[PDB]
Amino acid sequence: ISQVEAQRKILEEAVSTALELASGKSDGAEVAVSKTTGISVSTRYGEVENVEFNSDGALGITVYHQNRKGSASSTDLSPQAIARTVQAALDIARYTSPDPCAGVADKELLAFDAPDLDLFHPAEVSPDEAIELAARAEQAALQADKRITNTEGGSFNSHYGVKVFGNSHGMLQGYCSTRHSLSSCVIAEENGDMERDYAYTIGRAMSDLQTPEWVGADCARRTLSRLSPRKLSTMKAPVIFANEVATGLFGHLVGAIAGGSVYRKSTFLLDSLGKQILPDWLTIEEHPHLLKGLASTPFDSEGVRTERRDIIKDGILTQWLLTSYSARKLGLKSTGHAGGIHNWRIAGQGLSFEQMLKEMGTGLVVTELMGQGVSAITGDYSRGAAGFWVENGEIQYPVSEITIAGNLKDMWRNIVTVGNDIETRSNIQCGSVLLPEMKIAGQ
Amino acid sequence: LNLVSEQLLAANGLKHQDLFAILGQLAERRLDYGDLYFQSSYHESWVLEDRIIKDGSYNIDQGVGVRAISGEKTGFAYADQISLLALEQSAQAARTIVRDSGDGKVQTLGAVEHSPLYTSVDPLQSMSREEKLDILRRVDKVAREADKRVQEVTASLSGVYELILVAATDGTLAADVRPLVRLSVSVLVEEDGKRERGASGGGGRFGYEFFLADLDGEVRADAWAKEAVRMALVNLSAVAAPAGTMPVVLGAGWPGVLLHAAVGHGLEGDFNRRGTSVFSGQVGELVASELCTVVDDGTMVDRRGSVAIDDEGTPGQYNVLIENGILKGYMQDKLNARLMGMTPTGNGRRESYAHLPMPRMTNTYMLPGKSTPQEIIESVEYGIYAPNFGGGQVDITSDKFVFSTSEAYLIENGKVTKPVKGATLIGSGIETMQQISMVGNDLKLDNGVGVCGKEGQSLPVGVGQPTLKVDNLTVGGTA
Amino acid sequence: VLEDRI
Ligand code: NA
Ligand code: NA
Ligand SMILES: [Zn+2]
């Protein structure tokens, strides 16, 4: 707490120095600084493997003159280094072209008095204490079953951060945060076939984490479930996205409704504002000010206030996700989305995962996806998959070496239900999702 | 070495004897190895969009990274500055990996020569600012003139100038001066309310003058601007791809990223030392068709993927990994080479001073065979021709890879026919290599575009191959 | 994760 307070003072001063140096030679300027400190450790077969001490720092500035922009950055925060960085950005802005949508965020939208969201819960964890937590998690996994014949280790991370933002409208605000995580990953074998899986826990406070023994048990359960998979034959069938990949399915919406995509006409949802793109019972709630939230933030990367909004309400797309620049291109105002989204919440419609298997009856559950395979401009979707085949409402065997393909427009509009089995370790939080049909490629 | 030593050591108040002292602090503990890694870098970018020079940036970083190694174990600490105090603080944290005392016997520091693979001239200073921006302006003009359906063009120029120096307990003392430039082009086309995109570009380890040099009778930047438009128009016309298992003909160049995934990562020494790769213990076995010879080659003059020295000071090498189907060996760093009873190969790479090195690729490619590309296409009754790819992913434990096409066509009765939409291909790595039944006489490498990610560390790489045939592969279309 | 791209 004393180390972080010393860092915060240094960072606030660096921001103020950079803005004052820019002020006489520019119409506007934005400055961001950060410092992250902590430890990362790994184990192999319960013994220390790596011990890494982390210490990272950064200053960036953007300046504006005659609507021309220029940017520069440095990891050195000495007064002379800051002076050189400011001069470099000013020099660039002599040669870029006037662009009226560029500039500091609107004064009326800035978080001059930003809220305290309680993101900072420090722990004094020694390297040896960190190693023992990783070793306990890995050991619990390795001891679960004799088919576990190799390992990719235990891992523990604990870090604290400080961020300060300022601009030429007179905003200067900063906040501190912490993140701790514990994981393990092991390898099982059956008849020459090797499979690997992992488990983890994450939170802002150490006392929010699952035990090392819970992590190893979950790791082993997941890994053993993958053994002896089948490659399905080519077919059309219903598909459940298990909770852990259902969050990514909604995640593709972010790029499709980003202002940057909209003004460039590079999204398949260009003509969908105010239209029903999802089932009429589905609402996606954004909550940027949740205390301790994994993706909570008191202001965006341009200093703009963040707000409670229903991005989707009863299936209808209510707004774009805008920054200062994209808002100006569209004749609108920033929505506080510079740097991304800030905690999405989608409620379940009453069924457990088991009840969802029974409703589907026969079909595919996907638990892991690989590759890119999503077109921003058309919505076309084609990704590699692993999971389980389901028949008579029961899991029959694992599957792999298959793809699932369709189009996001059709997939989102025709969702059957969303489960109560909510994944709670991510930015976007939802349960498992049932779709009526996708094309499965295989044998 | 003398030039880099003056910039990284002398200018920061450091001498050769300070290196002795800090290596000695590490060697107070029972270690197999320790090293000091020094780096400075300068990055610039310029972006054209909406017919104007929209943006520019200038980014600086510098620092030192210090490792202490005992068998399987590494202690590591680093700082965003180069100074004696930063070295002492980093060494004293790193060495805590082992408590036991060592004998203190380090090897005397001593540099040796290596072959030069690229210029030491700074690309950021060697061309004027207006000449750089004229490259982007020309790309904009040529793309828009190529077809009336072109509505948007984004063109970017990027440059890096990097100095590195490494000193180790085994006596290694070495330095590199590393330039890297890149031109990227993206276009949007529109017709009757339908829109699609296309992209081109490349570069390597040299100045920006490369982009104004000749490519087959035209200025290189013009050729690439036209290629992004061609790509976008193919995509605009493309129909649904078929679904299922069928023959696939892969084009020369960047489609070599599938080799990089299906076998390259599988032959990195860290996975094989631990026993987690499907290729572990298989040296001397048939892991691919007898038509296949695959190399990793760090020695290629001027290439994006090359390494005059790697980040541990080992000069780049031509390494034969698979020869006529038979597995010959693995790519190494110093740690994994020792543990496997093998030798360094020139594959010890790190993203920066703030990251650990590990075994990593350089330029990975398949040698040419006897078939013509025409003969390969003519051999397929029904399948896909894929001359260009985007990106993808591999799981080396289960031996599964997944890559997405960026330009693809049906083959019907031995002829290329309809363009088809982007599809993801999936298969097993070893099974796929055993299914390669024809290898073309037309080897090329990518234009200088490759990025490889492993353990969160991104590196510049190259890939290549001739045209080749995979007899059965799963195609993730909808039709 | 092992990811490769242009
Ligand atoms: Na001013
Ligand atoms: Na040589
Ligand atoms: Zn790679």
Residue numbers in the entry:
A (entry chain B): 8 to 450
B (entry chain A): 3 to 481
C (entry chain E): 600 to 605
Excerpt from the publication:
Using a combination of biochemical and crystallographic methods we show that E. coli TldD and TldE interact to form a heterodimeric metalloprotease. TldD/E cleaves the N-terminal leader sequence from the modified MccB17 precursor peptide, to yield mature antibiotic, while it has no effect on the unmodified peptide. Both proteins are essential for the activity; however, only the TldD subunit forms a novel metal-containing active site within the hollow core of the heterodimer. Peptide substrates are bound in a sequence-independent manner through β sheet interactions with TldD and are likely cleaved via a thermolysin-type mechanism.
Attempts were made to trap uncleaved peptides in the active site of TldD through the use of a catalytically inactive Glu263Ala mutant. Surprisingly, the resultant density was essentially the same in every case, irrespective of the added ligand. We therefore focused on the highest resolution dataset, which had been collected to 1.45-Å resolution after co-crystallization with the engineered angiotensin variant described above. Clear density was present for the backbone of a hexapeptide spanning subsites S3-S3’ (hence E263A-hex) and, for four of the residues, probable identities could be assigned based on side-chain density to give an x-Leu-x-Asp-Arg-Ile sequence. This bore no resemblance to any of the added ligands, but curiously gave a match with residues 49–54 of TldD itself. A possible explanation for this could be that proteolytic fragments of the overexpressed TldD protein are comparatively abundant in the expression host, and this particular fragment binds with high affinity, principally due to the Asp residue in subsite S1′, the side chain of which does not occupy the pocket used by the n-pentyl chain of actinonin, but rather chelates the catalytic zinc. Remarkably, hydrogen bonding is restricted to backbone atoms only, such that the peptide acts as an additional β strand that effectively fuses the β sheet and the β barrel motifs in the C-terminal domain of TldD through anti-parallel interactions with both supersecondary structural elements that extend from subsite S2 to S2′ inclusive. Furthermore, binding of the hexapeptide does not result in any significant conformational changes. When compared against the phosphate-bound structure, the RMSD after superposing TldD Cα atoms was only 0.33 Å (averaged across both copies of the subunit in the asymmetric unit).
